[PDB]
Symmetry: C2
């Protein structure tokens, strides 16, 4: 089968304007208007407001294309819109072909008869989603309560696009994925899947083929499964009748090289190569498809305090270190593989087991799931429903089930995908008071019947789980299932309160923090708006009372500041500490609490929000805290009623021997505690390592600390405790003494020592890839923390600045 | 009967020390230790911590006194401890006399036999309440959950003394009221009461006498009721038998001059003068006792949304403008009539209908209730139980009923006292989760049986009401009964949220604010602690996260400041605005809501807290906002989706005619849609006066306003609205133009005009009694706001300063 793809440039105009302007085909209306200069950068200042009219208008896209006489020879031609932003009417040579209800799925159309030779005309009328949805809600028996934007629920589109806590109202339409014209003769591989049927010292496997035959024809399927070198090969023959045929073909892989997530093994991926072909030897459809071999179990077994909730890949239980993933741009077609690659490798090296693809953005581009596959980053896939009362009439349930079929059928092969999730927050929402005392949980049947059944039907390999918080009697309970901890941010509770949360799996929690100055500067329109509570700063904070929350949190541990640059450093470290102090505690429980998923990995535009990496892909400082908090092997401190209580954590398949040091030094002076001999941390477990009573501690002159050494020279982790908020600590300004070695042409090695306790030193260098940063430096220790700068020159990396809570600097 | 009173100086020492030091008799241990120089001022800095040992020690007080041969002639001598701080053993001439369990009642003891002529020795062993209570709790079948300090509950003492949200842990012991030796021959008036039996164009009344006769003897009672030309006089004669005799003597008062609260009438008080008299003509006991003549009804009648909760004095329903009253010092004997007089006259002139004597301090000194009587300030009297699980065994219930009898018997006569209340917050507490998941509501029987019955027994004149929040299903409901709104402060919700609270009576709500600088300076120990989040500033804020709340609220409407002095002005106006915006809204409902009681009128020590007048009696600025919010006749503004909605409120018995002005001016320019109509506000009611569509408003350059003129074209109230937080208002710095007339010797009259909108101008003058300030001044208006300074000279009143949010120049 041959593919003429209609990607490239199209012409487009408002439903009723005269001019046809130029447009790009994986596109948005907004993009094309930006490119033609017709509307300002919505991401800048208060331009969101300027551009609300786009949303309200209907739109027409049109391409003219040239088709051969050769090409019409193909006995069937179907037109395939890989993705399309919701509501559309699509005409070919001035004749209808179908509506589209849906952004999240492919739409395919039979056109052989309507096609003519030479020039052709494809016309796509894109309806204002605002207008279309508010009609659909007006027509509906009841009124349904969303959030910001209620009628959102009545259509199948990216729920964030109408505005969120961290997104803006850029409700874009557009042909948001490839448009292919496909021509084929006799038959076509329709789907291919390679489920592991059951596993052991040897691996049993099926190959599930859908095939759509038009004539009743003899066919040969021939395949080769390959790891590095081809492990297996086979040919088979069928004589099948016209229609959709399905086959499960068993086969065996001896000594299977088994997929594991990062840190618990290797990311072995088999490749399947399969050619459908004719009786005459002529190939009809090929398909490469990659897959892994792995068990997944969602261990849900009762105990004292409630019920477990733990992932078990290949029978090893992994604590899920992670973060919630959200669309990387408000206009989706600008995200390039470059971008996904950068955010995901940054996750990898921060030490991330898992990403929850949050059910309010989208089902991702294949590039996302195929990197997650390679990098060992398991994913928690939500079905795209979030924080609202959805419709639940038959007409709708069919649309939903139709999409669920497609989505699963697409993503099934990715060994990274570890769970299917029904929704975000709805069961919690109805069970709590938000959206009222209604008897009908509006949407329940989607979560209860529709989805579990389509999941059970098409994918035995993975657990379905009906809701993003679904912890027992009160869906957010700490006894059963997973938990969303918004006590801390949204309720205002001090972030130390994460210590009193013992939920079986924290799938959501976070703290806000404004981006790096560079990023800030790109969206503020003036230097007069560069102050913490400016119109443009609060306007770029879509959380109801976000800035005053940030300012609250800063004011827990710190002296308030009116200085913009101080505020940024201070607020961003608070973010680190909130995340740190939570992440550390959940890990200290280990399998009582078998998971921590940070509430924001990325941003979809330049905004003050929970994200640990901003829209322009510039690491918040909290990223380095999160790397630290995820260190595969780690020591944490944790109070208990006037007695401190250190911990030891292995996220590794092998027991660890190594020395710890306690202490309780002053900010100058020298320790008041016991250096320890060898300690063991057993494989894949948290262990209590030490106690240390403190019934006469000088809270404002002293601080308890811990350092962890592996069997070699090396510092592998450290940690500290303070007994009073930083602002009251009689903490002398330190002086730090750094120097810079060069290990390989662009790799460097940074050496630091400090007199007194210096805190959160901030290594600034325009394009560096720091292995660690925003660091505490203790008296009596010298630190060798490596980096690189594949940008700057050998003498110019000594134009490196650095700052901290308490400083003077030297060399 | 003759009274030798043992007030004066006593000797005292720790249970086991050798030195006897000097002491004062209405006293505290702490006081006497302070006075002897043995311990620092607990109110200064972090001295609270220094003085915790006092609490733990047992104490001995001793007086030696001289008694005549003439005095023993009296056939019965009883010793009367008017008040004593809890747990004591009391010896006379080295022989026991009784324990005391109770601070809140008089203790009386028969001593004629134990007395000797000449020198005598009274010895009072005062037990450490800390030690005594924790014993009592340890002995108890179950553990009971208080708050800060749990075992608090097992004793009868001032619950605040063990520390609160705004108080510190100064758990003082001491002989806290007068000690009288009483000698009498034959009989004594034991109690006297003058209940109004029923009322009308004429007034029917009883006189209830208890009398304790020792011999069976003929007696004459003779009385004169006086208004104060004596309206009535009478003599009666009885021949009664030994024991406690009781009599209800009916009489009638023609055309009674009727007590009303301030604003709704006159505070007429009759005086009763009654002499119990022998057969010879010799007086045995006199009683002077004051009383009022008034109905009180607590209207609790169902309607659409829930059930009313409205006070009706003499059939007129009064909206209770008010505040919660709490003990005026941590050590009670220092409060002098001077102090009560100052705090209560300041309440009067702020325009206060009511004070709730909060059930965690004490039953007040007679001076409090007799001023409340004179000044027309109705009181809501709590029985002293607050925010805890109290014991409910027989042994305890008897102690409780014994105290309730005494308390009521004492306070019954005061026409100010308008309600008896069971507790503070307990029904709410058990119904909510705090101390929750207990089947036994741990003091219910106190609230359900004990107290209502003793109230019903001894006082038909007043409603009993079982709990300080006692709604319906959920005791804090807005549908029924009264309500405590801690959404705003304690939950963190923006103070604009008071607009969405429609509770039938708001008995509690508040916002914190640090005191005046002068006051601050008295307790801070250094100028280095004079910054908003210093150790000593947070230490003098006993609310868990008080400072960071304050800083959150400031950061709602304003730019944060690192400056101590700014912070004070800004935070204190926030307090005004929180209180204002609530008080105004509750009044706009009028009898749907029927009451607003501010959470803090006063302080018991120098502290950052809700109080509207600080420990040293220096008005917070919010006092002037509260006066403004209480203006008997008033116009308020109140948003509605897309349109503003002005209101009109009469707390007066007569309809009001007068002109209002709308507007929507810029901060300079006076422009839009000046709509300048007459209007009527009917007597004792809220009425909607105007609407005003806010179509296309410049939120950052403009502000809607209202002014109210009486028939004389005098300004009597004004009000304003803003559409964005002050910090973003393009608001020019104003310049004000003031000058000072003299009305009478020490009275003055201050004239102001301003170019642009000046906000919250701050009239500073060392001893002035401002009739208004912290005032907004509009463009085209000249203000004559009167004051006085009975301290300074007329030419020295022109050493008056002033400041505001925006002030380039003055005069
Ligand atoms: O309340 C905080 C958070 O609650 C839920 C999340 O899915 C976010 O949309 C939001 O930021
Ligand atoms: O949570 C705030 C409040 O709770 C209770 C009240 O009686 C107040 O004393 C306190 O401030």
């Amino acid at each position: 089968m041959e593919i003429l793809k209609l990607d490239g440039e199209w012409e487009f105009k408002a439903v009723k304007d005269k001019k046809w302007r130029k447009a790009k085909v994986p596109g948005c209306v907004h993009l094309d208007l930006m490119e033609n200069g017709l509307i300002p950068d919505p991401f800048v200042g208060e331009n969101e407001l300027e551009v609300q009219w786009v949303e309200k208008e209907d739109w027409i896209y049109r391409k003219k294309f040239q088709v051969g006489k050769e090409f019409l020879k193909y006995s069937s031609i179907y037109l395939e819109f890989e993705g399309i932003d919701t509501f559309s009417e699509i005409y070919l040579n001035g004749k209808k072909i179908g509506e589209t209800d849906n952004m999240f799925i492919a739409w395919e159309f039979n056109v052989k008869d309507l096609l003519v030779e030479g020039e052709n005309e494809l016309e796509v009328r894109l309806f204002s989603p605002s207008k279309v949805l508010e009609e659909r809600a007006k027509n509906y028996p009841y009124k349904l309560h969303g959030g910001d934007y209620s009628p959102r629920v009545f259509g199948r589109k990216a729920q964030y696009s109408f505005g969120w806590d961290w997104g803006p109202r850029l409700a874009t339409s557009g042909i948001w994925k490839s448009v292919k014209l496909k021509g084929w003769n006799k038959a076509r591989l329709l789907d291919v899947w390679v489920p592991v049927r059951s596993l052991g010292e040897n691996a049993q496997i099926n190959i599930e083929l859908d095939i759509e035959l038009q004539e009743s024809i003899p066919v040969d399927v021939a395949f080769r499964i390959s790891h590095k070198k081809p492990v297996l090969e086979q040919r088979l023959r069928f004589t099948l009748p016209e229609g959709r045929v399905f086959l499960k073909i068993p086969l065996t892989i001896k000594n299977p090289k088994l997929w594991f997530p990062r840190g618990y093994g290797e990311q072995n991926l088999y490749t399947l190569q399969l050619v459908l072909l004719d009786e005459k030897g002529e190939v009809l459809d090929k398909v490469e498809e990659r897959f892994g071999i792995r068990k997944v179990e969602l261990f849900t077994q009762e105990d004292n305090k409630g019920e477990s909730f733990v992932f078990k890949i290949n029978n090893i239980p992994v604590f899920a270190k992670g973060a919630n993933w959200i669309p990387a741009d408000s206009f989706l077609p600008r995200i390039k593989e470059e971008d996904y690659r950068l955010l995901l490798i940054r996750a990898k090296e921060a030490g991330v087991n898992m990403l929850r693809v949050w059910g309010g953005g989208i089902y991702e581009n294949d590039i996302f799931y195929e990197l997650c596959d390679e990098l060992g980053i398991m994913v928690w896939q939500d079905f795209m429903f979030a924080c609202a009362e959805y419709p639940d009439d038959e007409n709708f349930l069919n649309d939903v089930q139709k999409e669920a079929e497609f989505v699963i059928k697409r993503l099934r092969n990715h060994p990274s995908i570890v769970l299917w999730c029904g929704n975000n927050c709805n069961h919690w929402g109805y069970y709590a008071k938000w959206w009222g005392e209604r008897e009908k949980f509006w949407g329940e049947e989607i979560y209860s019947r529709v989805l579990p059944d389509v999941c059970a039907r098409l994918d035995l390999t993975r657990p379905y789980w009906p809701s993003s918080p679904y912890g027992g009697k009160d869906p957010n309970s700490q006894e059963v299932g997973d938990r969303h901890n918004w006590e801390v941010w949204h309720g205002w509770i001090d972030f130390n309160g994460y210590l009193k949360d013992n939920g079986r799996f924290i799938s959501e929690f976070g703290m806000q923090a404004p981006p790096v100055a560079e990023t800030i500067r790109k969206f503020i329109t003036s230097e007069k708006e560069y102050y913490p509570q400016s119109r443009e700063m609060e306007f770029h904070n879509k959380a109801r009372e976000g800035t005053e929350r940030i300012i609250r949190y800063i004011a827990g541990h710190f002296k308030i500041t009116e200085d913009m640059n101080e505020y940024i450093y201070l607020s961003q470290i608070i973010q680190g500490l909130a995340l740190k102090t939570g992440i550390e505690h959940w890990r200290n429980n280990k399998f009582h609490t078998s998971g921590s998923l940070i509430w924001q990995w990325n941003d979809c535009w330049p905004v003050v929000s929970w994200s640990i990496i901003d829209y322009y892909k510039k690491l918040k400082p909290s990223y380095y805290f999160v790397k630290r908090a995820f260190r595969d092997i780690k020591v944490n401190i944790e109070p208990r009623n006037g007695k401190l209580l250190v911990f030891g954590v292995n996220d590794t398949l092998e027991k660890f021997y190594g020395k710890i040091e306690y202490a309780i030094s002053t900010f100058r002076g020298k320790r008041r505690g016991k250096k320890e001999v060898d300690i063991e941390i057993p494989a894949n477990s948290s262990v209590i390592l030490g106690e240390f009573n403190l019934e006469d501690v000088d809270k404002f002159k002293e601080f308890f600390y811990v350092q962890l050494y592996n069997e070699k020279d090396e510092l592998i982790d450290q940690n500290e405790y303070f007994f009073a908020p930083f602002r009251h600590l009689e903490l002398p300004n330190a002086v730090v003494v750094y120097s810079v070695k060069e290990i390989e042409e662009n790799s460097y090695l940074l050496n630091i020592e400090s007199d007194f306790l210096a805190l959160w030193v901030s290594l600034k260098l325009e394009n560096a890839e720091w292995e660690d940063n925003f660091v505490n430096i203790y008296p009596k220790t010298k630190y060798s923390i490596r980096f690189k700068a594949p940008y700057t020159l050998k003498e110019v990396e000594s134009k490196l600045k650095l700052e901290g809570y308490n400083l003077k600097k030297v060399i």
